[PDB]
Design a binder for this molecule. Structure first.
Ligand code: HEM
Ligand SMILES: [Ca+2]
Ligand SMILES: [Ca+2]
Length: 199
């Protein structure tokens, strides 16, 4: 028989949302109202440059399967720290806004797709509550429309998609965005090594 093996490498450029990074690193979430400040930490292969509205993230491609590009990496945002004592080891447990996205997956079919993410985010209850984390594994955070159909049999792919928050994503982001809210666009920078085997 004739078999096709596709090995996909590369990165995805996805800032999540510029105005969210601007707010989180700014004086509302991490200014003079709070004794302890948080910010943004990245891990597991994410690269980042800039701060606030200029911040960018690149996420490493782990590989592909039929209809999906699997990314690695994690980003953690923290703000609105509710703790004002003198024990700094308490601060990490007291950020009212405490959001983590990791291992995004881009599912696709032609020029449509879905952005899946592992998430851990405190629920927004009110401004005086450190609420319990909401969590999800490969949850649908956004829908995607690409500027061309995704074809992983092409060796070099650079394609950008617009993203819109899902109903699931509404609760992840504290209900501050409505369903359908635009998020940052996602660019896939892929190299697809296609090997045909008679085997
Ligand atoms: C003490 C608790 C909180 C306070 C006082 C607070 C305050 C604010 C304020 C005043 C804004 C509007 C800023 C602007 O429009 O320029 C805002 C925006 C926002 N907040 Fe928070 N917030 C809190 C908790 C949270 C939580 C837990 C989340 C969960 C992710 C969250 C997510 C957001 C988002 C997504 C926006 C929109 C940012 C944008 O414009 O892109 N907030 N918050
Ligand atoms: Ca070539
Ligand atoms: Ca292109």
């Amino acid at each position: 028989m004739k078999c096709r093996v596709v090995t996909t490498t590369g990165t995805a450029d996805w800032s999540v949302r510029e105005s969210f990074n601007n707010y989180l690193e700014g004086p509302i979430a991490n200014g003079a109202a709070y004794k302890y400040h948080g910010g943004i930490e990245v891990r597991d292969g994410v690269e980042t440059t800039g701060t606030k509205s200029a911040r960018e993230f690149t996420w490493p491609v782990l590989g592909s399967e039929e209809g999906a590009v699997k990314l690695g990496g994690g980003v953690h945002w923290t703000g609105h720290n509710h703790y004002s004592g003198d024990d700094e080891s308490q601060a990490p447990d007291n950020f009212i806004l405490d959001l983590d996205f990791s291992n995004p997956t881009v599912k696709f079919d032609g020029n449509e797709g879905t952005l899946l993410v592992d998430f851990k985010s405190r629920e927004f209850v009110d401004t005086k509550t450190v609420a319990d984390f909401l969590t999800g594994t490969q949850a649908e955070l956004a829908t995607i429309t690409f500027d061309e159909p995704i074809d992983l049999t092409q060796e070099n792919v650079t394609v950008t998609g617009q993203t819109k928050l899902t109903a699931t994503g509404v609760d992840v982001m504290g209900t501050f965005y409505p369903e359908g809210e635009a998020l940052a666009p996602i660019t896939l920078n892929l190299t697809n090594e296609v090997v045909l085997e008679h085997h």
